[PDB]
Assembly symmetry: C6
């Protein structure tokens, strides 16, 4: 029952700061980086919901301070249906298994 | 004769919530995630039409409450022509066979 | 010398409905789904010119009734040059031969 | 050294009409279809310069009559440097060799 | 080290003209064509800085004369750091070695 | 623990100049070039934080002087979490190892 947190920014430098602040703020794993066009990019973290809450809060705080930085949207899902794991890029991957809690 | 339900959002975090709420609300299978540019992303579910109708209703309800969320369009097709299955990314895939009802 | 009909929408769910209405309304084969960016997507049907004309008219009517539905452009070519078949994605493919008429 | 003709449209159905009108109007070969984002797509023809001029002129006339159709730009180069052949998608390919004049 | 020249236009027909004009005007090699979205495309030349200077001036002049033509930006770097050669698409490639000077 | 510097421009020629000025201004390695659409492109450097500061400052100064040049955003992270290395295109690669300090 692993939670998922997401921060979407306009521009790449701000999404890197969001990711960095998120994994430094709490026990979460950065598993994803998704581009959907219009300069909209999202970073996705997984972990226990309380950790994810703290991560996202810290990521939002730091991302908005980036020069030219813009946060567009953000969301947490405490208990994502496991169907999502097999369709959307929110899942752990072999390349980040070392960073799982 | 399996129905198809679709919710299109502006932004990725909102489309994840759309998918989550859809598959939790009724007996439907999330089979697809489609990017067409300009931040427009769609999630696609299959199931009996009445299930799909309930899922789409719940998905719209929750996606709109996502911070920075916006729903652009949505649609249900009760009985899609099977020609659509071989051209459009709405078909069941091997990766989600385990979630079929 | 088989005709080709095309409906371009802004948004994915309406293009799926466009495709559905087309192949249900008359004797045409859905052969293509083309993304050119910025939310612009086209579905492409082949068949006798009179069928194609019936399909497109229906597809336009149906797509516009989609919540958030929008049509950008549409066109029919009765006798497309065969040179187009080898450059533009309007040709029959193996995966839809079973739907040829 | 063979002339190159190009018509860029907003929307896909229009660019298909452009191509069709071009290869029907004179002795040219459709060799390329190029997407650069923003809904801008270009079709590219090769042939003798006076043929290319007649093809482009006809393509411009037909494409603009497409419902929802817009021509964005167009150009003819009578004698393109052969360096362009190896970098830009304007060259003949194996798939259209049967349509060389 | 070898200079690099760049012209970015809105629209594909205009970069083709920019490329053609550049390689005809001086001793430079066309090595690259780069799409970054929103219809922005750049053609890249390499050569002695004085040559590149002449190529770019000619490309700018000719590109702006293209029907629907628009130049968005352009730049010359006389002596690019070799690090750029291994990251950005400005380097000579096998396909254009025959055109080096 | 190696710092990361990022400059995002609107347009490609300007991002090339940014990279060039960056690696020439201090001891940093250009490791990445990232496109996220809508003409937004970012160049990424690694090095000691004081070096990255000097490079980014110099890249910003030079990029804004490019004809049609436009900087959208920029950021420095002195001590990026190692998790980001396996998700975001900010890491060293084989192709640039010879330029590591």
């Amino acid at each position: 029952p692993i939670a998922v947190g997401m921060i979407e920014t306009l521009g790449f430098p701000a999404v890197v700061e969001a990711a960095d602040a998120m994994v430094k703020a709490a026990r979460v794993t950065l598993v994803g980086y998704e581009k959907i066009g219009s300069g909209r990019v999202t970073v996705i973290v997984r972990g226990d919901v309380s950790e994810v809450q703290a991560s996202v809060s810290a990521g939002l705080d730091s991302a908005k301070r980036v020069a030219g930085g813009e946060v567009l949207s953000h969301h947490i899902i405490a208990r994502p249906h496991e169907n999502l794991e097999y369709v959307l890029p929110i899942r752990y991957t072999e390349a980040v298994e070392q960073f799982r809690m």
